[PDB]
Design a protein around this ligand. Structure first.
Ligand SMILES: COc1cc2c(cc1Nc1nc(Nc3ccsc3C(N)=O)c3cc[nH]c3n1)N(C(=O)CN(C)C)CCC2(C)C
Ligand SMILES: COc1cc2c(cc1Nc1nc(Nc3ccsc3C(N)=O)c3cc[nH]c3n1)N(C(=O)CN(C)C)CCC2(C)C
Ligand SMILES: [Cl-]
Ligand SMILES: [Cl-]
Ligand SMILES: [Cl-]
Ligand SMILES: [Cl-]
Ligand SMILES: [Cl-]
Ligand SMILES: [Cl-]
Ligand SMILES: [Cl-]
Ligand SMILES: [Cl-]
Ligand SMILES: [Cl-]
Ligand SMILES: [Cl-]
Ligand SMILES: [Cl-]
Ligand SMILES: [Cl-]
Lengths: 492, 492
């Protein structure tokens, strides 16, 4: 799948070419060695080759391993961890730690056992070991990768191979990054039609939100660029398409998802919504057609074209935006609103997943926006026997017409909502890491995709929009596809 | 055999500690990338990881491989070389080369086919590829190894395990470098006895000569250091001891070497003598007791305590030095002399190897220095039937009493002497590289070794003498013993 010609442009530069990055990059520990996948990998390689750091690195790795392990393996793991690093006879005893820290980590039993230990380990690693890393070859090799990350990688680097859909949103293609073979979805916005529909500012707002979030539960933006005709956003491809299709069109006679599958998607959508709300962004368009499914069985939220970022000291907004059937009463009435709107839409979405109809409209019923609006404002929802008591109760809590009484985001988090009995069987710590096996695994639908004067103000906007490569996704791609391993070899 | 505790002091430094070496080292291409084993290895690793340099490196390696191959394999090698790098369809065609150079290298057939090609390859490598190496991680890793090479590695680093011999020369021990396990011979000079026998200047002259030669046919000096009681020279151990022992004491009834074995040692001693004479050094003590044998079957000259380096514009010297029986007439008469003296001693040594007696004295005969001196000056040598015509003729040529008529060093080399029919079966190019199988392989004799106020002028001399680690031998040891491979790993 890799193409030779583009793979050959991924060459590490001479060191002298990296002297300007060295001045201008943020070189803090958390930002470089914890948050950037290449930074982390290179930091850990430095630790592994410096025997004095062996215990700190192996303890670091063993805590991450513990944090994502199946419930049945945690006793034996927390025993092996303690014996290797914490007990007085431990072969890899971590003597940079406080006696208190070692004490507490040897006691304790519940969730987040070792989270305090981990903070201590990362705190230690950010002092002398990090300073030694900055004076090593490994740090320079990080600057070389960062120089590469910053090079031009525009339309030429992507091969379009299938049309996924066209409409007012632009056109979306399945495409392949030529050097690595990685598959992506590319959304293309026609520059002329965009100017004439005065959509510059909306498009920019969407791109910005996508660039600044980084969640496994939200489609990722990996590249933003321009062509002569289009502005282009290269993002995670979700091979299953939208979940609405799956609710109705897979078992046509008996549509709807089984509860475990519905619950698992809800949990992933809640994780996505929390990520946005913690960054002061309101999504405003949650519905089944904008929740996408991949062929591992996981979902992400997509279509961030109606989303708003709240400004400094802003807790509410106004503005009529959404999809009829999913907009909360407070929005339909023209009031100010906050993150609450997305929780009502969540309620509606879960209802549909289980019932294969919405709470206000029978399957296939045709309702004009006025008749729908008055149903959302006045109609009490009923629940068929198809709903368990926990799914009914969760749904009632989200469908509260008064946002003051609705379940949602409280005290900076969704942790309140995570405690509802609906989610009693979800291991959030494995969900967060992508390590919880989905209750259902679908087939890919990529084969159902069919084959393939501006002013200076227009120019400057396009070029600002075309900000290029996003660091974190690019580092992921390089590691995942094996390119990092191949180009980072010291002696074959 | 490696010891953990000393191995642990071989740690590569932080980069900032190498900034002063970077200013003060000679960083020329020939000196760093061709002559220093670690420099070369790191240069070749840089070439191997930069695909554009692949052809130059593989051609470089294939020429060295050709230069040392058994005679029967050279046709097929020179064919495979031409097809890979030189013909218009060659997969690894070397397009930095001139069309003339490629032409000549495709023609030709004799000895030194590709020597002009090799000069062209190394000339090319010393331009842009070398400049790219200096701007790479590989060059910095070279500075790190050079910093290590310069660290204190005195008496503590060596474990003495056997006494090889004691006398007026000091004491010689078999010893082991603790970090690497490498075995060496260590010669120790007692500081008090040395001062009192006024031997400071002689000892210094010897150390200096050993440090500045680098030949596979001369014992190598690897470390020079002091203790509270001794000055110490750590050098190649030669496990067989001196060849005099082997002439007489292995087949006691029928002593002497077979001609092929004698010829092979002579060829190696000539290679050693040429190395000295090309550096304007006269050995002055060649004899069987100072030619040492190792258990691969190869010999080196040792005991450089009488050697002289001629000064600028000096072609002759005077001074009565040597061993009775091996000193040339011109020296015995008190005349000026040059490199010719060592060729007479060669004559004597070869005579003894074949006859198991000297040319002037029967086996076991006792002759006072006066009666011997007059025999060397007046007696015509005779040759038993034991001598082939070629060995007789070579011996006659070296035993000429008139140094003007003696075979020797002419026009900067021994190439004249190399053409004598005696050496018709020696492949000099494999001999020079250590790649000619010896006609005889002996057993090691290490088990016959038995177990274990100064002025400020004295102080300054000892510390000048104790110059520490010699770069080239140290880099060899690191590579040979596997330490280089182990510490130079980038990702285990
Ligand atoms: C192999 O992948 C697919 C195949 C299909 C779809 C979507 C995808 N995948 C996909 N589709 C995307 N968006 C998309 C596809 C059709 S319209 C559309 C959009 N308006 O964003 C995105 C945006 C980020 N990542 C994406 N991944 N389709 C849909 O999900 C249609 N719904 C959005 C309404 C079109 C149907 C097929 C099977 C081709
Ligand atoms: C396992 O190694 C040996 C063992 C023995 C000898 C020499 C060596 N090896 C040796 N011997 C060396 N020198 C040496 C050993 C005894 S005296 C002496 C010297 N005066 O330099 C050197 C100097 C550089 N490298 C050396 N290697 N011996 C001799 O070669 C004695 N002749 C020089 C006269 C002593 C005998 C044994 C077997 C112990
Ligand atoms: Cl690692
Ligand atoms: Cl390093
Ligand atoms: Cl299902
Ligand atoms: Cl509805
Ligand atoms: Cl209804
Ligand atoms: Cl959990
Ligand atoms: Cl190599
Ligand atoms: Cl490099
Ligand atoms: Cl023999
Ligand atoms: Cl004699
Ligand atoms: Cl005689
Ligand atoms: Cl030859």
């Amino acid at each position: 799948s890799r193409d030779r010609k583009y793979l050959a442009r991924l060459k590490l530069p001479p060191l002298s070419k990296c002297e300007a990055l060295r001045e201008s990059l943020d070189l803090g520990f958390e930002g470089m060695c914890l948050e950037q996948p290449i930074g982390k990998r290179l930091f850990q390689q430095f630790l592994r080759t410096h025997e004095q750091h062996g215990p700190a690195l192996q303890l670091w790795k063993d805590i991450e391993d513990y944090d994502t392990a199946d419930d049945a393996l945690r006793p034996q793991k927390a025993q092996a961890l303690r014996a290797a690093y914490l007990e007085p006879q431990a072969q890899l005893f971590c003597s940079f730690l406080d006696a208190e820290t070692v004490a507490r980590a040897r006691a304790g039993a519940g969730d987040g056992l070792f989270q305090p230990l981990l903070r201590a380990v990362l705190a230690h690693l950010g002092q002398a070991p990090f300073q030694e890393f900055l004076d090593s070859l490994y740090f320079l090799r990080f600057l070389q990768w960062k120089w590469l990350e910053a090079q031009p990688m525009g339309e030429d680097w992507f091969l379009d191979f299938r049309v996924l859909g066209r409409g007012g949103f632009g056109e979306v293609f399945a495409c392949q990054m030529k050097a690595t073979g990685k598959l992506y979805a590319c959304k293309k916005l026609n520059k002329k039609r965009l100017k004439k529909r005065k959509g510059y500012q909306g498009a920019m707002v969407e791109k910005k939100i996508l660039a600044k979030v980084h969640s496994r539960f939200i489609v990722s933006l990996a590249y933003a660029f321009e062509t002569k005709t289009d502005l282009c956003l290269v993002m995670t491809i979700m091979n299953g398409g939208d979940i609405r299709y799956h609710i109705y069109n897979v078992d046509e006679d008996n549509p709807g998802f089984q509860e475990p599958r519905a619950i698992f998607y809800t949990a992933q959508i809640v994780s996505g919504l929390e990520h946005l709300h913690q960054r002061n962004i309101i999504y405003r368009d949650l519905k089944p057609e904008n929740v996408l499914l991949d062929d591992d069985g996981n979902v992400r939220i997509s279509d961030l074209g109606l989303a708003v970022e709240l400004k400094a000291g802003q807790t509410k907004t106004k503005g009529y935006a959404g999809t009829p059937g999913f907009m909360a009463p407070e929005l339909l009435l023209g009031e100010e609103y906050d993150f609450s709107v997305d929780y009502f839409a969540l309620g509606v979405t879960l209802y549909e997943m289980i019932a294969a109809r919405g709470p206000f409209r029978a399957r296939g019923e045709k309702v004009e926006n006025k008749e729908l609006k008055q149903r959302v404002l006045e109609q009490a929802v009923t629940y068929p026997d198809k709903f368990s008591p926990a799914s009914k109760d969760f749904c009632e809590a989200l469908l509260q017409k008064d946002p003051e009484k609705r379940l949602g985001f409280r005290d900076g988090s969704c942790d309140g909502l995570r405690t509802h009995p609906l989610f009693r069987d979800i291991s959030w710590r494995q969900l967060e890491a992508g390590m919880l096996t989905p209750p259902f695994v679908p087939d890919s639908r990529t084969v159902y995709a069919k084959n393939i004067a501006f002013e200076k103000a227009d120019t400057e906007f396009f070029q600002e929009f075309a900000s290029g490569t996003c660091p974190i996704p690019w580092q992921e791609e390089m590691i995942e596809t094996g390119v990092f391993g191949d180009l980072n070899v010291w002696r074959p």
